[PDB]
Amino acid sequence: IDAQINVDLQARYQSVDGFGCSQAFQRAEDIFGKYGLSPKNQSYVLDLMYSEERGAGFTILRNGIGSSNSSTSNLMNSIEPFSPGSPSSTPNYTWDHYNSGQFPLSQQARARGLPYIYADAWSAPGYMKTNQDENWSGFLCGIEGETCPSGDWRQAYADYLVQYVKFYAESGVPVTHLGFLNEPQEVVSYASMGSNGTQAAEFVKILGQTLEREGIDIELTCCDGVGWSEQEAMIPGLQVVGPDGKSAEDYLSVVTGHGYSSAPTFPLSTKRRTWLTEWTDLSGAFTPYTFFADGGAGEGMTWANHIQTAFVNANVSAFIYWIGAENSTTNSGMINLINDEVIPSKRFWSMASFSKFVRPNAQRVKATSSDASVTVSAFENTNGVVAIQVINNGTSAASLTIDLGKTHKEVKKVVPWVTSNDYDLEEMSEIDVKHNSFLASVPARSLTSFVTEC
Ligand SMILES: *[C@@H]1O[C@H](CO)[C@@H](O[C@@H]2O[C@H](CO)[C@@H](O[C@@H]3O[C@H](CO[C@H]4O[C@H](CO)[C@@H](O)[C@H](O)[C@@H]4O)[C@@H](O)[C@H](O[C@H]4O[C@H](CO)[C@@H](O)[C@H](O)[C@@H]4O)[C@@H]3O)[C@H](O)[C@H]2NC(C)=O)[C@H](O)[C@H]1NC(C)=O
Ligand SMILES: *[C@@H]1O[C@H](CO)[C@@H](O[C@@H]2O[C@H](CO)[C@@H](O[C@@H]3O[C@H](CO)[C@@H](O)[C@H](O)[C@@H]3O)[C@H](O)[C@H]2NC(C)=O)[C@H](O)[C@H]1NC(C)=O
Ligand SMILES: *[C@@H]1O[C@H](CO)[C@@H](O[C@@H]2O[C@H](CO)[C@@H](O[C@@H]3O[C@H](CO)[C@@H](O)[C@H](O)[C@@H]3O)[C@H](O)[C@H]2NC(C)=O)[C@H](O)[C@H]1NC(C)=O
Ligand SMILES: *[C@@H]1O[C@H](CO)[C@@H](O[C@@H]2O[C@H](CO)[C@@H](O)[C@H](O)[C@H]2NC(C)=O)[C@H](O)[C@H]1NC(C)=O
Ligand SMILES: *[C@@H]1O[C@H](CO)[C@@H](O)[C@H](O)[C@H]1NC(C)=O
Ligand SMILES: *[C@@H]1O[C@H](CO)[C@@H](O)[C@H](O)[C@H]1NC(C)=O
């Protein structure tokens, strides 16, 4: 079919912080050879994830603030594993320069140019909660409606999160973003802690005011809701103005949600930047080579479309997959490790196509398609490089006319990068741009990134 694409760089929307993943629950250790990954492939995996030149150039790493009093199973151990006795008692903090592999990972990401580290707690330690357990949800003692005999642990949890941040900064790795909940809706056998919008809002202000007293500059986030509409449901709570004249929203830099219980397909009703902070296929299926087959949950194109929809329809500034690389034959990670073997999925190459060319502080700009089989997004980088992502979900190749409209300079060359059943992230021959317009074919069932050269 013939499709006209029109890009208007004068119609500008949200800014981009970028793309990344987590290595939480000891999956950092997989990248560092726990299951036999060779030194060559450890370096290769870190290059795929964090090198702009050789891989995806991911700009966000989401690390877990461990709540556990051991490192058995897949547990993330805490800097304050055992009760100090009472909320006012002196904490016994312990720093291992490790954080379940996440500390060295952070160093090696940063060494390759990673700007943003997002530290997120799944739970306060057990002894700070109503149920005296890091597991099975429960509430931080002292938040509205949730008293405990042992007293009020709110300030203690804020001081604990700040201590985690200081250990990182004093070891040469500043944390840029901090969250204190993960999926507060979920009652599960692993690290988890509940709260509604009002309870979340109450702690945002305590944590915010605590970081101001300590003179620590960091971006606060909430609430990593299990789904987008679950996060939406908490935002009015975060927007309630208390007698102090402030909302939790006044302290937040970023509102965060997951895609599991509902996908980012509409804009959250906050004035802050929004991030999709966790999403993957948890079916247990294994589809590393499939860009398109039947629209399965683990397919390359499914994730190409999740990403494009999140930016174009859900107005996000970042997209963070769940696990980057893990020793498994499931779709829960983007890169499958099989002992000393690296298999990057089409889900990874889809993320890489966006991340490689849509760099931090890029602005999303208007892009329209004359045919629904061909979906488009466009971003302008701060250096002026325009990156246009085109998903052709046609059963046949699409002949595109792409019109960049009025630009700052003039555009003379554009380079296509293709992802499909046949290609990972394949650089094609440059295309001549005449009067800020060019012709291009895109294959059936493909993602193409068109990147302007100078
Ligand atoms: C190191 O950290 C671990 C993990 O956080 C701690 O182990 C937990 O300790 C807590 C506190 O005693 C235990 O909490 C209790 O959990 C019960 C659930 O019991 C069963 O269910 C699960 C899953 O099927 C099993 O893992 C478990 O073994 C049990 O068979 C709750 O029913 C209890 O609730 C009662 O007490 C609370 C708190 O006072 C009340 O609010 C309740 O209403 C109710 O009366 C209780 O919450 C927890 O089970 C332990 N987990 C594990 C995995 O062992 C260690 O305590 C900690 N060690 C140190 C030294 O700090
Ligand atoms: C999509 O997300 C972006 C954030 O990435 C949202 O931008 C935010 O828009 C609001 C409302 O326009 C801005 O607040 C306003 O600020 C101006 C200038 O200070 C002021 O005149 C208004 O009274 C109001 O407070 C906010 O600054 C802006 N946020 C950022 C980070 O730029 C955008 O609104 C979202 N779009 C949709 C449709 O939800
Ligand atoms: C580092 O990782 C690479 C990439 O996984 C490893 O190389 C790959 O090793 C596997 C063997 O486990 C090879 O798989 C074989 O591929 C052929 C097809 O070409 C297939 O017919 C066989 O059944 C088998 O699956 C793979 O080809 C191979 N080399 C590549 C992709 O270049 C490597 O062994 C790891 N270690 C080191 C030290 O590099
Ligand atoms: C691309 O088009 C195909 C149909 O040609 C869509 O595939 C369907 O996807 C759903 C789940 O989204 C499956 O339940 C159906 O079985 C699929 N139909 C097939 C394979 O015939 C696919 O969703 C489209 N992808 C887009 C628009 O991103
Ligand atoms: C790593 O994953 C593969 C594939 O699932 C599995 O068979 C293997 O046993 C795992 N390695 C170790 C050392 O457990
Ligand atoms: C949140 O929880 C508290 C304590 O149960 C309750 O008082 C409050 O009304 C709840 N907030 C909302 C918005 O339901």
Return the SS3 of 393: coil
The CA–CA distances, whole Å, from 7 to 30, 180, 280, 446 equal 42, 39, 30, 20
Q: What count of other Cβ atoms lies within 10 Å of the Cβ of residue 16?
A: 25
| Contacts of residue 313, Cβ cutoff 8 Å, sequence gap at least 6 | 264, 265, 266, 267
CA of 296 to the centre of ligand 5 (A): 24
Among 203, 274, 186, which residue's Cα sits nearest to residue 232? 274
Pairing of strands 318-327, 374-380: unpaired
Please give the resolution of this entry in Å, rounded to 1 decimal: 2.2
Q: How far is CA 393 from CA 153, 375, 404, 448, in A?
A: 52, 8, 22, 11
Pull the structure tokens for residue 87: 């909320």
Closest C-alpha among 276, 160, 154 to residue 204: 154
> Regarding beta strands 219-225 and 252-258, do their DSSP bridges make them parallel or antiparallel, or are they unpaired?
parallel
CA of residue 442 to ligand 4 center, whole Å = 19
State if residue 343 touches ligand 5 by the CB under 6 angstroms criterion: no
User: Are residues 125 and 67 in contact, defined by beta-carbon separation less than 8 angstroms?
Assistant: yes
Q: What is the DSSP letter of 431?
A: E
* Residues recorded for the chain: 454
What is the DSSP-derived secondary structure letter of residue 407? Answer: -
Residue (of 268, 271, 164, 270) closest to 218 by Cα position: 164
Ligand closest to the CA atom of residue 361: 2
Topology at the third CATH level for domain 18-361: TIM Barrel (3.20.20)
The type of residue at 171 is: S
For the four alpha carbons of 205, 210, 214 and 218, in that order, the dihedral sign comes to negative
**Where do runs of H (alpha helix) occur along 117-263?**
154-170, 197-213, 228-239
Alpha carbons 17 and 176: distance in angstroms, whole number: 12
Chain centroid, CA 68 distance in Å: 23
Alpha carbon nearest to ligand 6 atom 11, residue: 198
- Is any ligand 6 atom within 6 A of the Cβ of residue 144? yes
CA–CA gap between residue 135 and residue 159 (Å, rounded): 21
Q: β-strands 413-419, 398-403: how paired?
A: unpaired
Q: Counting ligands in written order, which one lies closest to the CA of residue 299?
A: 4
Ligand 2 atom nearest residue 267's Cα: 39
Query: Is any atom of ligand 6 closer than 6 Å to the C-beta of 147?
Result: no
Sequence spans of domains, the chain: 2-9+366-453, 18-361
CATH fold, domain 2-9+366-453, is: Immunoglobulin-like (2.60.40)
CA of 273 to the centre of ligand 2 (A): 8
CA distance 224 to 183: 5
- From the CA of 15, which ligand is nearest? 2
Q: How was this structure determined?
A: X-ray
CA distance 78 to 81: 5
Which DSSP letter does residue 53 get?
T
Residues forming beta bridges with residue 413, ordered by sequence position = 432, 453
Say how far apart CA 391 and CA 404 lie, in whole Å: 18
